[PDB]
Design an enzyme around this catalytic site. Structure first.
Site, PDB file in Angstrom:
ATOM      1  N   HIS D  61       0.842  -1.198   0.000  1.00 59.35           N
ATOM      2  CA  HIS D  61       0.000   0.000   0.000  1.00 59.35           C
ATOM      3  C   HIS D  61       0.871   1.240   0.000  1.00 59.35           C
ATOM      4  N   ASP D  91      10.741  22.244 -24.675  1.00 56.84           N
ATOM      5  CA  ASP D  91      10.598  20.904 -24.097  1.00 56.84           C
ATOM      6  C   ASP D  91      11.496  20.889 -22.862  1.00 56.84           C
ATOM      7  N   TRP D 126       7.161  -0.590   4.696  1.00 59.90           N
ATOM      8  CA  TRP D 126       7.832   0.049   3.581  1.00 59.90           C
ATOM      9  C   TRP D 126       9.240   0.507   3.956  1.00 59.90           C
ATOM     10  N   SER D 156      14.830   6.117 -12.002  1.00 58.58           N
ATOM     11  CA  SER D 156      13.855   6.950 -12.711  1.00 58.58           C
ATOM     12  C   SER D 156      13.858   8.382 -12.168  1.00 58.58           C
ATOM     13  N   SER D 157      13.745   8.504 -10.842  1.00 63.84           N
ATOM     14  CA  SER D 157      13.600   9.821 -10.232  1.00 63.84           C
ATOM     15  C   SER D 157      14.919  10.581 -10.185  1.00 63.84           C
ATOM     16  N   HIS D 240      13.290  11.079   5.374  1.00 67.75           N
ATOM     17  CA  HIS D 240      12.699  12.370   5.728  1.00 67.75           C
ATOM     18  C   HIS D 240      12.713  13.292   4.512  1.00 67.75           C
ATOM     19  N   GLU D 242      12.376  12.471   1.567  1.00 65.83           N
ATOM     20  CA  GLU D 242      11.267  11.945   0.762  1.00 65.83           C
ATOM     21  C   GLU D 242       9.907  12.533   1.165  1.00 65.83           C
ATOM     22  N   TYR D 244       9.257  15.436   2.312  1.00 68.76           N
ATOM     23  CA  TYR D 244       9.146  16.796   1.803  1.00 68.76           C
ATOM     24  C   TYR D 244       9.079  16.785   0.274  1.00 68.76           C
ATOM     25  N   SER D 255      -0.040  27.027  -4.243  1.00 70.63           N
ATOM     26  CA  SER D 255       0.185  28.458  -4.457  1.00 70.63           C
ATOM     27  C   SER D 255      -0.482  28.951  -5.734  1.00 70.63           C
ATOM     28  N   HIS D 290      14.481  11.659  14.021  1.00 72.89           N
ATOM     29  CA  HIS D 290      13.186  11.638  14.729  1.00 72.89           C
ATOM     30  C   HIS D 290      12.335  10.446  14.322  1.00 72.89           C
ATOM     31  N   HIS D 291      12.805   9.626  13.381  1.00 72.18           N
ATOM     32  CA  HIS D 291      12.178   8.335  13.118  1.00 72.18           C
ATOM     33  C   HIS D 291      12.805   7.212  13.937  1.00 72.18           C
ATOM     34  N   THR D 316       7.366  26.710   7.299  1.00 74.19           N
ATOM     35  CA  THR D 316       6.107  26.173   6.839  1.00 74.19           C
ATOM     36  C   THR D 316       4.967  27.136   7.179  1.00 74.19           C
ATOM     37  N   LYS D 319       4.486  29.821   4.755  1.00 79.03           N
ATOM     38  CA  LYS D 319       3.701  29.486   3.558  1.00 79.03           C
ATOM     39  C   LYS D 319       2.207  29.441   3.860  1.00 79.03           C
ATOM     40  N   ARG D 438       0.788   0.535  15.519  1.00 84.84           N
ATOM     41  CA  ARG D 438       0.611   0.377  14.088  1.00 84.84           C
ATOM     42  C   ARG D 438       1.137  -0.993  13.657  1.00 84.84           C
TER      43      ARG D 438
HETATM   44  C1  HEA Z   1       3.754  15.048   3.250  1.00 86.51           C
HETATM   45  C2  HEA Z   1       4.552  14.285   4.044  1.00 86.51           C
HETATM   46  C3  HEA Z   1       4.964  14.739   5.394  1.00 86.51           C
HETATM   47  C4  HEA Z   1       5.238  16.013   5.845  1.00 86.51           C
HETATM   48  C5  HEA Z   1       5.179  17.323   5.034  1.00 86.51           C
HETATM   49  C6  HEA Z   1       5.538  15.872   7.187  1.00 86.51           C
HETATM   50  C7  HEA Z   1       5.842  17.010   8.052  1.00 86.51           C
HETATM   51  C8  HEA Z   1       6.300  16.842   9.396  1.00 86.51           C
HETATM   52  N1  HEA Z   1       6.440  15.667  10.095  1.00 86.51           N
HETATM   53 FE1  HEA Z   1       5.987  13.816   9.494  1.00 86.51          FE
HETATM   54  N2  HEA Z   1       5.844  11.973   8.677  1.00 86.51           N
HETATM   55  C9  HEA Z   1       5.418  11.553   7.430  1.00 86.51           C
HETATM   56  C10 HEA Z   1       5.059  12.475   6.378  1.00 86.51           C
HETATM   57  C11 HEA Z   1       5.239  13.887   6.545  1.00 86.51           C
HETATM   58  N3  HEA Z   1       5.526  14.549   7.663  1.00 86.51           N
HETATM   59  C12 HEA Z   1       5.451  10.162   7.289  1.00 86.51           C
HETATM   60  C13 HEA Z   1       5.111   9.351   6.087  1.00 86.51           C
HETATM   61  C14 HEA Z   1       5.862   9.693   8.485  1.00 86.51           C
HETATM   62  C15 HEA Z   1       5.989   8.207   8.891  1.00 86.51           C
HETATM   63  C16 HEA Z   1       6.866   7.226   8.193  1.00 86.51           C
HETATM   64  C17 HEA Z   1       6.677   5.824   8.767  1.00 86.51           C
HETATM   65  O1  HEA Z   1       7.117   5.616   9.909  1.00 86.51           O
HETATM   66  O2  HEA Z   1       6.162   5.095   7.910  1.00 86.51           O
HETATM   67  C18 HEA Z   1       6.078  10.790   9.326  1.00 86.51           C
HETATM   68  C19 HEA Z   1       6.646  10.637  10.625  1.00 86.51           C
HETATM   69  C20 HEA Z   1       7.098  11.751  11.425  1.00 86.51           C
HETATM   70  C21 HEA Z   1       7.752  11.609  12.654  1.00 86.51           C
HETATM   71  C22 HEA Z   1       8.207  10.277  13.336  1.00 86.51           C
HETATM   72  C23 HEA Z   1       7.111   9.769  14.320  1.00 86.51           C
HETATM   73  C24 HEA Z   1       7.417   8.308  14.765  1.00 86.51           C
HETATM   74  O3  HEA Z   1       7.518   7.409  13.895  1.00 86.51           O
HETATM   75  O4  HEA Z   1       7.419   8.091  15.990  1.00 86.51           O
HETATM   76  C25 HEA Z   1       7.958  12.894  13.095  1.00 86.51           C
HETATM   77  C26 HEA Z   1       8.691  13.218  14.345  1.00 86.51           C
HETATM   78  O5  HEA Z   1       9.158  14.307  14.600  1.00 86.51           O
HETATM   79  C27 HEA Z   1       7.398  13.786  12.190  1.00 86.51           C
HETATM   80  C28 HEA Z   1       7.377  15.234  12.331  1.00 86.51           C
HETATM   81  C29 HEA Z   1       6.915  16.108  11.277  1.00 86.51           C
HETATM   82  C30 HEA Z   1       7.040  17.501  11.392  1.00 86.51           C
HETATM   83  C31 HEA Z   1       7.490  18.252  12.615  1.00 86.51           C
HETATM   84  C32 HEA Z   1       6.648  17.960  10.157  1.00 86.51           C
HETATM   85  C33 HEA Z   1       6.636  19.432   9.812  1.00 86.51           C
HETATM   86  O6  HEA Z   1       7.347  19.614   8.512  1.00 86.51           O
HETATM   87  C34 HEA Z   1       5.212  20.004   9.783  1.00 86.51           C
HETATM   88  C35 HEA Z   1       5.308  21.606   9.757  1.00 86.51           C
HETATM   89  C36 HEA Z   1       3.858  22.157   9.632  1.00 86.51           C
HETATM   90  C37 HEA Z   1       3.196  22.815  10.631  1.00 86.51           C
HETATM   91  C38 HEA Z   1       3.706  23.018  12.070  1.00 86.51           C
HETATM   92  C39 HEA Z   1       1.798  23.298  10.230  1.00 86.51           C
HETATM   93  C40 HEA Z   1       1.762  24.725   9.558  1.00 86.51           C
HETATM   94  C41 HEA Z   1       2.448  25.748  10.480  1.00 86.51           C
HETATM   95  C42 HEA Z   1       1.893  26.839  11.062  1.00 86.51           C
HETATM   96  C43 HEA Z   1       0.426  27.184  10.861  1.00 86.51           C
HETATM   97  C44 HEA Z   1       2.766  27.744  11.902  1.00 86.51           C
HETATM   98  C45 HEA Z   1       2.551  27.819  13.398  1.00 86.51           C
HETATM   99  C46 HEA Z   1       2.850  26.452  14.007  1.00 86.51           C
HETATM  100  C47 HEA Z   1       3.601  26.298  15.081  1.00 86.51           C
HETATM  101  C48 HEA Z   1       4.274  27.400  15.867  1.00 86.51           C
HETATM  102  C49 HEA Z   1       3.801  24.887  15.646  1.00 86.51           C
HETATM  103  N4  HEA Z   1       6.876  13.069  11.166  1.00 86.51           N
HETATM  104 CU   LIG Z   2      10.882  12.591   9.161  1.00 84.63          CU
END
Ligand code: HEA
Ligand SMILES: [Cu+2]
Ligand SMILES: CCCCCCCCCCCCCCCCCC(=O)OCC(COC(=O)CCCCCCCCCCCCCCCCC)OC(=O)CCCCCCCCCCCCCCCCC
Ligand SMILES: CCCCCCCCCCCCCCCCCC(=O)OCC(COC(=O)CCCCCCCCCCCCCCCCC)OC(=O)CCCCCCCCCCCCCCCCC
Ligand code: HEA
Ligand SMILES: CCCCC/C=C\C/C=C\C/C=C\C/C=C\CCCC(=O)O[C@H](COC(=O)CCCCCCCCCCCCCCCCC)COP(=O)(O)OCCN
Ligand SMILES: CCCCCC/C=C\CCCCCCCCCC(=O)O[C@H](COC(=O)CCCCCCCCCCCCCCC)COP(=O)(O)OC[C@@H](O)CO
Ligand SMILES: CCCCCC/C=C\CCCCCCCCCC(=O)O[C@H](COC(=O)CCCCCCCCCCCCCCC)COP(=O)(O)OC[C@@H](O)CO
Ligand SMILES: CCCCCC/C=C\CCCCCCCCCC(=O)O[C@H](COC(=O)CCCCCCCCCCCCCCC)COP(=O)(O)OC[C@@H](O)CO
Ligand SMILES: CCCCCC/C=C\CCCCCCCCCC(=O)O[C@H](COC(=O)CCCCCCCCCCCCCCC)COP(=O)(O)OC[C@@H](O)CO
Ligand SMILES: CCCCCCCCCCO[C@@H]1O[C@H](CO)[C@@H](O[C@H]2O[C@H](CO)[C@@H](O)[C@H](O)[C@H]2O)[C@H](O)[C@H]1O
Ligand SMILES: CCCCCCCCCCO[C@@H]1O[C@H](CO)[C@@H](O[C@H]2O[C@H](CO)[C@@H](O)[C@H](O)[C@H]2O)[C@H](O)[C@H]1O
Ligand SMILES: C[C@H](CCC(=O)O)[C@H]1CC[C@H]2[C@@H]3[C@H](O)C[C@@H]4C[C@H](O)CC[C@]4(C)[C@H]3C[C@H](O)[C@]12C
Ligand SMILES: C[C@H](CCC(=O)O)[C@H]1CC[C@H]2[C@@H]3[C@H](O)C[C@@H]4C[C@H](O)CC[C@]4(C)[C@H]3C[C@H](O)[C@]12C
Ligand code: CUA
Ligand SMILES: [Mg+2]
Ligand code: NA
Ligand code: NA
Lengths: 79, 43, 259, 514, 58, 46, 227, 84, 79
Positions: D61, D91, D126, D156-157, D240, D242, D244, D255, D290-291, D316, D319, D438
């Site tokens: 999945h 192109d 995964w 590819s990527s 990580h 990935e 982003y 935007s 942090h993972h 973030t 934005k 999970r």
């Molecule tokens: C689109 C994909 C995506 C994005 C953009 C993010 C963004 C973030 N992620 Fe997440 N994350 C995943 C996809 C993503 N994550 C995935 C797939 C996993 C799990 C993988 C797995 O184990 O399979 C994961 C796991 C993951 C973990 C590990 C948890 C664990 O396994 O125990 C953590 C820990 O810090 C984390 C943190 C964050 C943070 C801090 C952001 C930040 O970038 C978010 C920033 C955004 C905001 C804060 C909101 C907007 C902000 C405001 C409105 C401003 C004011 C806000 C404040 C002052 C707080 N993520």
């Molecule tokens: Cu991460």
């Protein structure tokens, strides 16, 4: 015969979550000491501290495997 | 956005067909497998 | 027609045959590792070599023979090659990371030391030092080739490039001999793992780089390069310096510091 | 001519169309896998009666959604269609290499299918961590086919990233600086730099897993002095970045969509938006551990990674507030694309905020490997990527196809989806806080109510997906051809009509310097 | 050796409508058909191997 | 050269909406069905 | 253990878990506030016929929306890190217990004095005594003294596992070749439950952890009764 | 950080040929001598069946499954020791 | 065990012309051994080999300075 031993105390050499080397070091310390104490004038009772610490900390299978390898001549640490 | 009138307009009847056909194409195969899960788990 | 300077490429089958070659090589490796057969792998290697040969042949046709590499097109190819080399640096970085991770914190299974108990490293002052002098020397000779080309000197370009290729071949034969003489193997724990996978991928890049230089040598024999336009030679030189710098990092890290 | 056009392509629009088709098909596969997951959990006990199969479904999945749905659609599909049009280029830089980035993906996907059909599949996660993914606990070909699937997707990527970076740096009009290029083009450039640097590290890591499984290396095997945790570092150093990569082209499309349907000529705070994307891309490389907050790392390392992770909220938030400030004062057009973008802003914000919760390594001890993490990323990634993709698809479908959608139907589809994803994932926060792990095929009885609700939610989103297919059919069936669109003065991709001719910008735009 | 590039420039610029990968003449077609036959046949063979490997073999 | 314009820049025909509906149904239905049949295959294997 | 329709954390059994609950309350308040402010402002932007479509200057407003998030992050990080450093500070335990993960059960070793060890398996649903909990009980619980600082050492004899007990705030990965330490202190007697927390194959869902906390004198009697 | 050499004025092919023959290839010649003095075989060490070496978790996909790819019988023992 | 100690044998840890660390290490070892033995059930005669080696190798003034610094609490090595 200073004891009152409960479990292994905190050791500033090994202050973090990974305690592998603490188990390993005391296992080496005990066995290095027990070898030394087979010279003239030696008793293994001096080695007791290391023995209690490694027995407290080390998984039984690690101790058993290490013992087996010391007997085989394949133990990779220096004793 | 602006657009010319439909070249080949799709009536409500035509939509109901396309929608039903679309939904059935997702639901029937998965339905068949899930219905028969116990026929699979016992083999 | 167009009034920009960029290259609209003729529809080509080589992307598809390259992608299929990748399917055949990977499924071929799977079949080799798990089903005792080299058949698919041999087909995939063959179609990969066929694909590369025809694709880069066509790039030569498009540029030397048809004139499509304007300065803008060349500039794009410069960026593309630099970016490709960067991706290759990051690939090696993963292997260096594995090496330092293992060697800076040797586990009890090793003897808690590095090199592990039972491992007897090569002397870095013997063949490894010779290999270092070989690749460093070929970086000097390929720079002589480059300047000779820019200065319009066909004979000395060919001599210098020949010397460069000869040194690359010498490195490869020295490394093949060292692999055979090594008393440790890839199955000798993490020492053997890091040593042979990291130097092995490097050796593969030496063979790739040497092949690229040989292509340039024959194109130079055929007068393809001008004194000002010769990006295949520049790319092969960049790639060759990359191979030389990876070696220096391997030498200092694995052979010398890790001994 | 059919084979020449669709198998031998050197055209950015046609290759973009192939990617959108591929990604949509992959989306159906990944949706079906997600429904099997939720069917297994939809009542207590066992449905499949084979938890290895369950684990294989979960693993597939994720790979399908990330590598075959999101990245091909965002980067291969919208990127190839839109980037050359938005900079007036004729192109991509390497139009023929571009076609190989596409054609590597059907073999990659075939290798993933093969993984799940041979032996008992790769039921690894995964993440594919050893030793579970090694040759004793996952003997046989499945994990190796998965590794090769990732190698092909990676090549590819990486090549697509080389193509996009080169195109964007080298093929703008001579007067256009980087600070005159649209935000979606920025977003693709930065995504491509992240791919270039991160995927080779993944490749190194899974190659070491391959050789541990087949050539008696011990990179990850303590018996040889290796370390399972080294694999995690290499994986997450890629993983990580990935996440982003998965959202950044989405930020770029959001935007453009918010700007367009607010009736604005430009997004609020353009240079801030560029700064914020570059900052997120940079910080995205220094937070990966942090993972790994429960693997046993030293307290000072946990403190650094907590702190560095939280800093990403600052760019973030710029934005998010800038999107709000783009709406500010707009003549709001309540189009279906605008609805997707508004749902994006809110649901992405919720998900980002639970990411900030998780960044605190103390609390992550209790939340790691629970459904709280699943809830976090299905908000920020799954809903984030899907809503930006849907907003982009509805907005640009008339450009790519020449035909309009039925807007009422598109709004209905949005409404169903919005209900379905929130019913599915919001209760998973409660399941996580209360300790449900999970990667489980069944759960203690206490967790029944929210699992039941979550599974019911998953069916609502299924109804939305089916409806989406019907809506696309209805548009191609009725053939309402586009005449004009508004705001072409600030949306160059529309100015060659709908669909644009096969060759566009044969005569480049005129832009002077003054 | 002598510089024959001009004669190859004349060959590869001939207005015969051929795409560059076939413009060298009949050998290009041969090499292309070899390549494509190996690729498509190997792909068929690889699908056969999937089928074989998907089921336990006794 | 190639055909241009609405319904001509795609690798599938939209000349007939019911033929199209069959094509789209086979296309998306095959991808959606595949995981159910792979699960079946694994459950049936042994 | 969790209970039906639970929304939040299990009740805290250790002081550190209480700290996390208070820290989570603090952070969730901020999460709710920011989420709700964003939603509100979206609705505010969308509910007026007034327009302003010419270029807007961004510099002033971007100070606010970098400085204020920066301050908020600091107000999260300060208690976050305080708790982190509390967990780590020297606790001088009176007992060390090892646990080894396996596919698919845990084993436990109490080797401070006597060499005690035993395996701990999930009770199958078909064998549960009436009123016992599906997927959570084990045959042999981890008997431990309450109100005492215990060192738990965690490893694995095969693949990765993870030893977790949510109501004590504990989760430590079980990695072969590695001995991870965590500290355990229960304020209360009772039974405390947890579940394997790193995917480990077929039966990941079915290798739970059950602690049995009792007064020291009863712990000693139980220890004593094992020789 | 530029060695003790010292010859520019407008870099060129002549200078890089001078470096190639006057420094680079002499260095190779000297390391080749060094190397083909310290060549000759060392005493191979007693075999000890250390469990972190001669790893076999899956047979190799060539030969009898138990020989490494560039196995040298003189210096590479098998898991059971040196060969006959 | 093999007395007729004549002098300190070759020690592969210290194969080169600078023998400072050989003297230092055996001095540490002897005094570490002596510390260990004076408490727990045992006697310094198992330390004797280190004593003979450091006495053979170490300049008198070095031993004397190190002994003074141990008495003073300023010896910088770990014993
Ligand atoms: C689109 C994909 C995506 C994005 C953009 C993010 C963004 C973030 N992620 Fe997440 N994350 C995943 C996809 C993503 N994550 C995935 C797939 C996993 C799990 C993988 C797995 O184990 O399979 C994961 C796991 C993951 C973990 C590990 C948890 C664990 O396994 O125990 C953590 C820990 O810090 C984390 C943190 C964050 C943070 C801090 C952001 C930040 O970038 C978010 C920033 C955004 C905001 C804060 C909101 C907007 C902000 C405001 C409105 C401003 C004011 C806000 C404040 C002052 C707080 N993520
Ligand atoms: Cu991460
Ligand atoms: C420009 C306008 C368009 C823009 C919009 C884009 C379209 C979006 C909506 C789309 C709406 C239109 C749908 C059109 C139906 C096409 C017929 C007879 C034909 C039957 C088709 C069935 C066959 C389907 C293919 C299999 C050449 C085309 C390539 C497409 C990608 C291949 C997808 C799968 C390949 C992977 C195989 C591994 C399986 C691995 C399985 C792993 C489990
Ligand atoms: C579109 C609809 C689709 C349908 C599906 C659902 C959608 C979600 C909408 C749901 C509308 C949500 C309104 C706030 C939900 C908080 C529920 C709660 O009581 O939470 C309790 C805590 C833990 O609390 C405790 O330890 C004690 C619990 C009991 C308190 C004492 C009272 C005893 C009785 C309680 C009765 C209930 C209390 C609720 C009080 C209610 C106050 C509002 O759990 C948690 O942290 C879970 C939080 C997860 C983190 C995400 C926060 C950001 C969301 C903000 C906007 C909502 C987005 C919705 C997502 C989008 C929604 C539009
Ligand atoms: C882009 C990424 C993406 C997307 C879109 C999705 C979409 C969905 N996901 Fe997925 N999911 C993952 C990425 C994604 N997921 C990942 C990375 C994991 C972790 C894997 C692991 O643990 O190894 C995961 C795990 C995961 C789990 C946890 C399994 C477990 O821990 O045992 C569940 C459970 O409900 C779930 C459900 C869903 C549902 C119901 C949907 C959707 O049905 C919601 C509706 C969306 C669509 C229908 C998309 C349509 C678009 C075009 C057709 N997902
Ligand atoms: C002469 C100088 C060196 C030249 C290169 C030599 C051959 C290497 C070929 C490719 C190298 C790339 C892969 C490296 C993999 C391991 C090979 C390491 C180098 C090598 O050749 O190692 C040899 C072992 O080879 C073995 O196992 C067998 C190796 C053969 C099978 C390899 C299968 C794995 C291929 C995986 C490819 C993944 C690529 C992914 C790219 C993705 C990009 C995004 C060492 O021999 P030994 O007998 O153990 O010890 C010598 C004792 N006398
Ligand atoms: C008993 C069964 C009940 C079915 C319930 C279905 C629920 C909702 C259906 C109504 C949704 C209509 C949405 C499109 C409105 C088009 C408006 C428009 O703006 O079209 C104009 C022009 C007008 C076109 C109207 C087309 C209506 C199509 C109906 C589709 C089929 C649904 C039924 C399923 C099969 C039984 C441009
Ligand atoms: C800008 C510099 C910031 C500082 C961070 C990087 C520094 C690495 C130094 C490691 C030295 C020991 C420090 C010990 C700290 C914890 C122990 C030990 C493991 O060490 C290990 O291999 C560590 C292995 C490296 C980890 C991080 C590697 C990232 C690699 C890719 C980065 C791109 C490089 C581009 C190169 C051209 C345990
Ligand atoms: C024993 C055999 C082993 C086989 C394995 C792989 C084998 C060998 C591959 C060796 C690479 C050969 C590349 C040959 C490229 C020739 C085409 C070329 O060089 O094309 C040049 C353009 O460069 C361009 O595209 C630049 C093109 C860049 C090519 C980059 C090649 C690197 C390849 C790496 C592939 C493997 C990756 C690593 C695996 C882990 C053409 O432009 P110019 O030179 O300016 O000429 C024009 C003038 O004449 C005008 O006056
Ligand atoms: C486990 C086994 C895994 C196996 C995976 C195998 C995967 C793939 C099969 C690969 C077959 C490759 C076939 C040759 C490809 C040549 C591409 C090339 O050379 O692309 C060039 C651009 O890339 C440039 O320059 C710079 C880039 C040159 C790239 C050369 C090819 C590299 C392919 C492998 C890359 C791996 C990444 C390595 C880092 C981890 C030219 O671009 P075109 O669009 O063609 O032309 C433009 C015209 O104007 C030219 O006149
Ligand atoms: C996760 C996504 C899944 C969504 C759920 C799908 C919703 C239902 C779709 C319908 O599926 C059909 O259901 C029938 C039962 O109604 C099955 O007939 C079965 O049952 C009948 C009645 O007992 C017999 O007449 C048939 O022969 C026998 O095949 C049939 O195979 C199946 O196609
Ligand atoms: C792209 C999908 C490909 C996945 C490939 C998986 C690996 C398959 C190789 C297996 O090939 C089969 O192996 C058997 C045993 O050696 C032979 O008897 C049989 O004749 C052969 O055909
Ligand atoms: C044939 C060619 C003449 C140059 C030209 O054709 O004008 C000459 C010039 C430089 C020569 C090459 C260079 O001197 C380098 C090599 C010298 C080696 O001793 C033989 C092969 C070697 C590769 C030479 C082959 C051939 O004699 C070359 C290639
Ligand atoms: C200087 C640069 C570009 C300005 C321009 O040439 O247009 C602008 C673009 C975005 C700006 C940044 C963003 O607006 C975010 C931050 C806002 C704070 O008010 C100052 C620092 C802050 C980090 C800004 C510093 C600087 O003014 C930046 C980096
Ligand atoms: Cu053991 Cu999960
Ligand atoms: Mg985990
Ligand atoms: Na040059
Ligand atoms: Na279940």
């Amino acid at each position: 015969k200073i004891k009152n031993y409960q479990t292994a105390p905190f050791d500033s050499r090994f202050p973090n979550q990974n305690q592998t080397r603490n188990c390993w070091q005391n296992y080496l310390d005990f066995h290095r000491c027990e070898k030394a104490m087979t010279a003239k004038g030696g008793d293994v009772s001096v080695c007791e501290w290391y023995r209690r610490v490694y027995k407290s900390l080390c998984p039984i299978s690690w101790v058993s495997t290490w013992d087996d390898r010391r007997a085989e001549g394949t133990f990779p640490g220096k004793i | 956005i602006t657009a010319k009138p439909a070249k080949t307009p799709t009536s409500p009847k035509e939509q109901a067909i396309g929608l039903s056909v679309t939904f059935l194409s997702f639901l029937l195969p998965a339905g068949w497998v899930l219905y028969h899960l116990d026929n699979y788990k016992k083999s | 027609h167009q009034t920009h300077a960029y290259h609209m490429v003729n529809p080509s089958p080589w992307p598809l045959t390259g992608a299929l070659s990748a399917l055949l090589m990977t499924s071929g490796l799977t079949m080799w590792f798990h089903f005792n057969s080299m058949t698919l792998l041999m087909i995939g290697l063959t179609t990969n070599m066929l694909t590369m040969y025809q694709w880069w042949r066509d790039v030569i046709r498009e540029s030397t023979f048809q004139g499509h590499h304007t300065p803008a097109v060349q500039k794009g190819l410069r960026y593309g090659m630099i970016l490709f080399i960067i991706s290759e640096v990051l690939f090696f970085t993963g292997f260096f990371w594995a090496f330092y991770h293992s060697s800076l914190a040797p586990t009890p299974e090793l003897g808690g030391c590095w090199p592990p108990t039972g491992i007897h490293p090569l002397n870095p002052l013997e063949v490894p030092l010779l290999n270092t002098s070989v690749l460093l020397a070929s970086g000097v000779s390929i720079t002589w080739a480059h300047h000779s080309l820019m200065e319009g000197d066909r004979k000395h370009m060919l001599q210098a490039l020949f010397i460069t290729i000869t040194l690359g071949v010498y490195f490869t034969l020295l490394q093949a001999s060292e692999y055979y003489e090594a008393p440790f193997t890839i199955s000798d724990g993490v020492y053997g793992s890091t040593f042979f996978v990291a130097t092995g991928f490097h050796g593969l890049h030496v063979i790739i780089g040497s092949t690229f230089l040989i292509v340039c040598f024959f194109r130079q024999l055929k007068f393809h390069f001008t004194s000002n336009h010769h990006f295949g030679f520049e790319a092969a030189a960049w790639y060759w310096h990359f191979v030389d710098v990876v070696w220096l990092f391997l030498y200092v890290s694995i052979y010398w510091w890790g001994s | 001519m059919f084979i020449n056009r669709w198998l031998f392509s050197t055209n950015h629009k046609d290759i973009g169309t192939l990617y959108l088709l591929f990604g949509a098909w992959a989306g159906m596969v990944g949706t079906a896998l997600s429904l099997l997951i939720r069917a297994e959990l939809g009542q207590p006990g066992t449905l499949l009666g084979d938890d290895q199969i369950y684990n294989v479904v979960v693993t597939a999945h994720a790979f399908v959604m990330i590598f075959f749905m999101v990245m091909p659609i965002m980067i291969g599909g919208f990127g190839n269609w839109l980037v050359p049009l938005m900079i007036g280029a004729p192109d991509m830089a390497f139009p023929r290499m571009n076609n190989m980035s596409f054609w590597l993906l059907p073999p990659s996907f075939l290798l993933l299918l093969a993984s799940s059909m041979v032996e008992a599949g790769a039921g690894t996660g995964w993440t594919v961590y050893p030793p579970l993914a090694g040759n004793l606990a996952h003997a046989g070909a499945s994990v190796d086919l998965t590794i090769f699937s990732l190698h092909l997707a990676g090549v590819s990527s990486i090549l697509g990233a080389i193509n996009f970076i080169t195109t964007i740096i080298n093929m703008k009009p001579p007067a256009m600086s980087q600070y005159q290029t649209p935000l979606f083009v920025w977003s693709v450039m930065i995504t491509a730099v992240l791919l270039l640097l991160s995927l080779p590290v993944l490749a190194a890591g899974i190659t070491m897993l391959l050789t541990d499984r087949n050539l008696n290396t011990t990179f990850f095997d303590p018996a040889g002095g290796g370390d399972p945790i080294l694999y995690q570092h290499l994986f997450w150093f890629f993983g990580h970045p990935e996440v982003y990569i998965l959202i950044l082209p989405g930020f770029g499309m959001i935007s453009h969509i918010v700007t367009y349907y607010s009736g604005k000529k430009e997004p609020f705070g353009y240079m801030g938006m560029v700064w914020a994307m570059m900052s997120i891309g940079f910080l995205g490389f220094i937070v990966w551990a942090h993972h790994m907050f429960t693997v046993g790392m030293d307290v000072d390392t946990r403190a650094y990674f907590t702190s560095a992770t939280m800093i990403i909220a600052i760019p973030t938030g710029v934005k998010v507030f800038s999107w709000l400030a783009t709406l500010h004062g707009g003549n709001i057009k309540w189009s279906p694309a605008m609805m997707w973008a508004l749902g994006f802003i809110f649901l992405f914000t919720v998900g980002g905020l639970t990411g900030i919760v998780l960044a605190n390594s103390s609390l992550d001890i209790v939340l790691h490997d629970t459904y709280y993490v699943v809830a976090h990323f299905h908000y920020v990634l799954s809903m984030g990527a899907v809503f930006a993709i849907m907003g982009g698809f509805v907005h640009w479908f008339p450009l790519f196809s020449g035909y309009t959608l039925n807007d009422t139907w598109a709004k209905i589809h949005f409404a169903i989806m919005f209900v379905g994803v929130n019913m599915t994932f919001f209760p998973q926060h409660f399941l996580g806080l209360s300790g449900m792990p999970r990667r489980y095929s069944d759960y203690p009885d206490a967790y029944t109510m929210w699992n039941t609700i979550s599974s019911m939610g998953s069916f609502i989103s299924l109804t939305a997906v089916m409806l989406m297919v019907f809506i696309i059919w209805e548009a191609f069936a009725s053939k309402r051809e586009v005449l004009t669109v508004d705001l072409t003065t600030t949306n160059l991709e529309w100015l060659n009509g709908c669909p644009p001719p096969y060759h566009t910008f044969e005569e480049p735009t005129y832009v002077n310097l003054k | 050796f002598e510089n024959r590039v001009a004669e190859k420039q004349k060959l590869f610029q001939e207005d015969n409508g051929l795409p560059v990968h076939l413009k060298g003449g009949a050998t290009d077609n041969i090499l292309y058909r070899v390549t494509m036959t190996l690729c498509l046949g190997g792909t068929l063979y690889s699908l056969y191997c999937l089928g074989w490997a998907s089921f336990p073999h006794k | 050269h190639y055909e241009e314009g609405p319904g001509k820049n795609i690798p599938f025909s939209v000349e007939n909406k019911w033929r199209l509906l069959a094509m789209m149904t086979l296309f998306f239905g095959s991808g959606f069905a595949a995981p159910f049949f792979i699960v079946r295959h694994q459950l049936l294997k042994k | 253990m969790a209970y039906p329709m639970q929304l939040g954390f299990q009740d805290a059994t250790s002081p550190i878990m209480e700290e996390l609950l208070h820290f989570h309350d603090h952070t969730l308040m901020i999460v709710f506030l920011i989420s709700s402010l964003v939603l509100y402002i979206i609705s505010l932007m969308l509910t007026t016929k007034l327009t302003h479509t010419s270029t807007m200057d961004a510099q002033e407003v971007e100070t606010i929306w970098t400085i204020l998030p920066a301050i908020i992050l600091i107000l999260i990080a300060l208690p976050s890190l305080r708790i982190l450093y509390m967990m780590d500070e020297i606790n001088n335990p009176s007992l060390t217990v090892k646990t080894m993960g396996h596919q698919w059960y845990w084993s436990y070793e109490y080797t401070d004095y006597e060499d005690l060890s035993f395996d701990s398996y999930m009770i199958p649903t078909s064998e549960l005594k009436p009123g016992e909990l599906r997927l959570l009980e084990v045959d042999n619980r981890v008997v431990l003294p309450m109100e005492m600082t215990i060192r738990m050492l965690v490893s694995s004899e095969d693949v990765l596992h993870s030893w977790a007990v949510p109501s004590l705030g504990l989760k430590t990965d079980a990695i072969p070749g590695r001995l991870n330490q965590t500290t355990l202190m229960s304020s209360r007697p009772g039974l405390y439950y947890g579940q394997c927390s790193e995917i480990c194959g077929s039966n990941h869902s079915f290798m739970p952890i059950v602690l049995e906390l009792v007064p020291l004198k009863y712990f000693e009697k139980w220890s004593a009764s094992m020789l | 950080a530029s060695a003790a050499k010292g010859d520019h004025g407008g870099t060129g092919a002549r200078t890089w040929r001078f470096l190639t023959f006057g420094l680079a290839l002499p260095s190779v010649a000297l390391c080749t001598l060094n190397s083909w003095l310290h060549s000759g075989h060392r005493e191979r060490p007693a075999f000890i069946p250390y469990h972190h070496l001669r790893i076999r978790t899956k047979p190799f996909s060539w030969g009898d499954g138990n020989h490494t790819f560039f196995h040298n019988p003189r210096v590479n023992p098998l898991p059971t020791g040196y060969e006959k």
